[PDB]
């Protein structure tokens, strides 16, 4: 079934995978260089092991797509998946005691969980205070999009590639990349989701993620959907039918917190994936909004807590 | 054998590769993302069915690793494998009949072969025709070891990897990037060789290659030598012993001249593949010359004239 890979890489993992520590003390288990394959045509690559939330998704993805890295968008549709960092560095910047909320966030969860929907709100309506503080700068939307050249000017990767999709369909050459080399010694998040590329082949679309490291059991089951979801929404602006996703990490991981967690869903059977309906008299994916993508018949297992 | 996965892309690709032209008239055959694995414990990946000049390779590989785009040090060394795009921006700058010398090179072959020594001896001793002609510029000794900024400084990515290797094996963060996307849009190559990463296993440092392209016949074999040669040089240099090579490509292709010359390697059985030594008390992979690189038992089928 579509979604094998996903569980195939979380057995390779408990079973064969590596021990090591991390940056935090909590451990690791991990694989050098795993590909996954996932067909397009036979459905969409959402898990039915686990509800993974579309919504959030999609409206992450349109963010980036719209090239904008500030929190608000995200917010204004419900979505707090990257409040975290900007929280972050709002609570040391000269103007704030919630230093090193994180490694006891689970120890308090009523002053933070409060004191993050306080900075929550002034972002939601206070423009002088989000230009500061609900801007992360440097990601995906800047990459994608804005690239900061050397001669001080901006460049849209995404936007070329996609009129070079439509130009050379048969181009090696149709790469996106989140690595900028000037900017990942001193930086927020060193992309993780470091490059793709497109490839043309009779008709269907297909695309390739880099990925340098993944958690497995919270960040991959997100990154496969996003991808998809790009990969579908360029078909569409193209006129291309739907290729292969291939999904290739340097680095993937579980933290030994989730042994357990992965486990249970081990047991679990996959089930008829679903389908993408998109607005078809639309193909401009820079502005799109919510409802221009369905997803149909999506039956999943229950959330697995975390 | 070690050699195998070399020879299981080149049937993949004929049997089931698909068509369509090329930047010339001549076809190719092609798959997107397909993975390589070669456990450098068990030898060294160089085609014993097909003799592969690992004289060049060197030269080729300490020449980027000097941080040098200059084709000198690879003339010194007997090595004309980058002549071609020097001699070529030479024959259009204000200052040169040998206009597409490429589309008719094989139809003349006298003073080319001649026109094209000529450049070549000119740039062996002339500083100032050298340092103008003899130049690259934007190729992997740069993007490797002197990265551009933007408040123009330059970068070595690769020694503070290295140092990095050194300091925090197990960092998800080891990357190295040849694409920059200021340059691409207008450039002699866009990188072949993508981008590439460390990683670090009990002991065993691993590396893995993003290749957006490839022409299996002709470069591939090359490719997977440097890369390995790459992976000892560093481990080498870390005081660790040799992982997998971990090669992946976007689009990995055969163009339609070369469909025999594969065919028939393809009838040739693999040897056992041979050894590296490497000078045991040197440690700065850096300052490296020819003779610190030794390959034991090299048993090549006949090179294949191409
Ligand atoms: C604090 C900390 C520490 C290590 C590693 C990450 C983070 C973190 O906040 N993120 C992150 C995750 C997602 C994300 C989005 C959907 C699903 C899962 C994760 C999006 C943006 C992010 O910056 C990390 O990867
Ligand atoms: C003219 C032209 C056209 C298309 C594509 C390439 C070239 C070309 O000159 N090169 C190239 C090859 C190698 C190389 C090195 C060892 C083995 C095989 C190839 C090294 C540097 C190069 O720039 C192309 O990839
Ligand atoms: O979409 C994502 C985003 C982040 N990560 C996580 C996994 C790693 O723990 C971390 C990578 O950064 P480093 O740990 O390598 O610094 O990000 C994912 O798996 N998927
Ligand atoms: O080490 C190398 C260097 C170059 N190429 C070739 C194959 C492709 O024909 C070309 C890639 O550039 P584009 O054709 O995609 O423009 O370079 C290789 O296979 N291996």
């Not at 694989?31 to 036979?42: A, Y």
């Not at 993620?209 to 790009?230: C, E, K, T, W």
């Not at 290739?248 to 993408?276: C, M, W």
Request: hydrophobic share 40%; net charge negative.
């Amino acid at each position: 079934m579509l979604e094998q890979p996903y569980l195939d890489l979380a057995k390779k993992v408990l079973d064969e995978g590596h021990f090591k520590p991390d940056r935090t003390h909590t451990g690791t288990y991990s694989i050098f260089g795993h590909q996954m394959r996932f067909d397009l045509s036979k459905g969409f690559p959402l898990l039915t092991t686990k509800k993974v939330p579309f919504g959030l998704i999609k409206s992450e993805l349109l963010w980036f797509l719209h090239g904008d890295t500030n929190i608000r968008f995200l917010l204004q549709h419900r979505n707090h998946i990257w409040d975290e960092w900007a929280f972050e560095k709002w609570v040391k910047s000269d103007e704030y005691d919630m230093t090193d909320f994180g490694h006891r966030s689970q120890k308090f969860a009523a002053v933070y969980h409060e004191e993050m929907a306080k900075f929550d709100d002034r972002v939601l309506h206070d423009d002088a205070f989000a230009a500061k503080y609900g801007d992360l700068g440097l990601v995906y939307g800047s990459q994608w999009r804005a690239w900061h050249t050397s001669k001080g000017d901006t460049i849209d990767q995404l936007g070329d590639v996609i009129e070079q999709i439509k130009t050379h369909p048969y181009s090696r050459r149709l790469i996106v990349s989140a690595w900028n080399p000037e900017d990942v010694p001193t930086m927020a998040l060193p992309p993780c989701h470091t490059l793709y590329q497109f490839y043309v082949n009779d008709g269907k679309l297909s695309l390739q993620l880099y990925q340098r490291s993944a958690d497995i059991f919270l960040g991959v089951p997100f990154n496969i959907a996003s991808y998809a979801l790009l990969t579908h929404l360029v078909a569409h602006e193209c006129g291309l039918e739907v290729g292969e996703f291939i999904h290739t990490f340097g680095d993937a991981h579980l933290y030994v917190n989730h042994l357990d967690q992965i486990k249970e869903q081990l047991s679990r059977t996959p089930r008829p994936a679903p389908t993408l309906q998109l607005n078809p008299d639309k193909h401009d994916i820079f502005d799109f909004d919510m409802k221009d993508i369905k997803l149909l018949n999506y039956d999943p297992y229950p959330a697995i807590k975390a």
